[PDB]
Write a protein that binds this ligand. Structure first.
Ligand SMILES: Nc1ncnc2c1ncn2[C@@H]1O[C@H](COP(=O)(O)OP(=O)(O)O)[C@@H](O)[C@H]1O
Ligand SMILES: [Mg+2]
Lengths: 70, 371, 70
């Protein structure tokens, strides 16, 4: 009577262990992707400020050149 | 005493006391009734389910929206929702709490008249007031000028304001909103093989749209990219399993706001209506309207909407003008925060509609000196 | 006899079930973090390229104004 229940419990335990291993693999992949995205966004946000200041200086020089032209 | 601020809105009711920072109670404006017979005896279930309680028993209910586009089509259900809000959620008697209500622009006068009649006679509020959504959104944003865009679930309207002076002749109202987006998402999901018809599955489609959809900066480029790569697919879990996948439909549904021709509407996109509303104003106030473009409402919560809006407006506006878009994180609750700010002002204490004053002036007092 | 084996199997099943539940919870947490990071980095990719193009046309306008002023 109890042998079938024991076999089912063993099978579901094996399935749970396989699901746990798959979950660990997916978690590791997601963490690696998140770290890569964080590094990329850090570089992007540290170079966008330089781009913004460059364009601001360019437009200020444009304005003063236009004034002198007038 | 203290003032009570309510916001019927459309599809979501958010109410709370004046002077607070966020609404105390938020729940959908849904009333449901059981369409089956029921076999158990002695259960004693009630006739109708209202508010968030009806969402927990969605499987045996039919859901009806008393508000279609700003206007109220069913009044018994609206009274039920108001009673629920006043009693079950806040547990406050409205006999000693002034109520500030919120109304969209360009609406029939009968809506306001019946709203005030129900508030004064059915609930016996000491005083009340009705205010426009866009003005209160501007209050919450901290600005004093700037054209504001409010796109909720029922209606989308633009109200330009300069130095505290509204421009009624430049107010544009469009009926394209979140509900039409959900309907188009239903119409487009059938292409892949997923069919949603029942009103209970309307909430499932709405949840998919809220949690998965995004706005594409370029439409043709994104369509070309998704036609070859498989990096745009994301999976969703239905309430019973049966995981589904969605591809192009991720960004095609929000594109209806910029391409109303998808659902057959004649009007143009919000990016063009905003520019037209700005151009309908004078020539000396356009700088501040360009530089103080305010967005609020639930449908605005799409990721990437601000970038696309700014790109389109800059493509339309002259290259000299600086284009800025204000998208605060709490866009959805902007109207309620503005209402809480307004109802707490000292100078607002003499702009209420009193009980005896309403009795003397009749239901049509709303359009008089007191607004 | 068999009762102790079944009790041990049930205890192990409960322990691995709890571990599996924690594994999922962490999996959705990491997935949400990665998705948020990816959305942010893509949005500011679009922002940084548009800003760079703005800088480019600003520089071109400045050069044209400079030669006109000369
Ligand atoms: N995070 C979100 N992403 C996308 N859409 C959302 C989000 N939150 C809410 N919405 C949409 O906004 C609508 C709610 O708008 P709401 O703020 O109630 O407008 P109103 O106050 O005019 O009734 C919902 O129908 C929903 O589709
Ligand atoms: Mg609203």
């Amino acid at each position: 009577s109890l042998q079938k229940k024991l076999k089912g419990t063993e099978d579901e335990l094996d399935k749970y262990s396989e699901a746990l291993k798959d979950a660990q693999e997916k978690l590791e992949l997601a963490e690696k992707k998140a770290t890569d995205a964080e590094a990329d966004v850090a570089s992007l946000n540290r170079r966008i400020q330089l781009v913004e200041e460059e364009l601001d200086r360019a437009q200020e020089r444009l304005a003063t050149a236009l004034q002198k032209l007038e | 005493t203290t003032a009570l601020v309510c916001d019927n809105g459309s599809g979501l009711v958010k109410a709370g006391f004046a002077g607070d920072d966020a609404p105390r109670a938020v729940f959908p404006s849904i009333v449901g009734r059981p369409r089956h017979q029921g076999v158990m005896v002695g259960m004693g279930q009630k006739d109708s389910y209202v508010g968030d309680e009806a969402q927990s028993k969605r499987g045996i209910l039919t859901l009806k929206y008393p508000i279609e586009h700003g206007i109220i089509t069913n009044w018994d259900d609206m009274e039920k929702i108001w009673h629920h809000t006043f009693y079950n959620e806040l547990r406050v008697a409205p006999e000693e709490h002034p109520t500030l209500l919120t109304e969209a622009p360009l609406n029939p006068k009968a809506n306001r008249e019946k709203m005030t009649q129900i508030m004064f006679e059915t609930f016996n509020v000491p005083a009340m007031y009705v205010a426009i959504q866009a003005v209160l959104s501007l209050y919450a944003s901290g600005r004093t000028t700037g054209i504001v865009l409010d796109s909720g679930d029922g209606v989308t309207h633009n109200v330009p304001i300069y130095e505290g002076y509204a421009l009624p002749h430049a107010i544009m109202r469009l009926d394209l909103a979140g509900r039409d987006l959900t309907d188009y998402l239903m119409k487009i999901l059938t292409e892949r093989g997923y069919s949603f018809v029942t009103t209970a599955e309307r909430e499932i489609v709405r949840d998919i749209k809220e949690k998965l959809c995004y706005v594409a900066l370029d439409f043709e480029n994104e369509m070309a990219t998704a036609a070859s790569s498989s990096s745009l697919e994301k999976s969703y879990e239905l309430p019973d399993g049966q995981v589904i996948t969605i591809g192009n439909e991720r960004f095609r549904c929000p594109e209806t706001l910029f391409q109303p021709s998808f659902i057959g509407m004649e009007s143009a996109g919000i990016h063009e209506t905003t520019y037209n509303s700005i151009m309908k104003c004078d020539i000396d106030i356009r700088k501040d309207l360009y530089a103080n473009n305010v967005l609020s409402g639930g449908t605005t919560m799409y990721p990437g909407i601000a970038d696309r809006m700014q790109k389109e407006i800059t493509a339309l506006a002259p290259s000299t003008m600086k284009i800025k878009i204000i998208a605060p994180p709490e866009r959805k609750y902007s109207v309620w925060i503005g209402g809480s700010i307004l109802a707490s002002l000292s100078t607002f204490q003499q702009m209420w509609i009193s009980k005896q004053e309403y009795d003397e002036a009749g239901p049509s007092i709303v359009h008089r000196k007191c607004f």
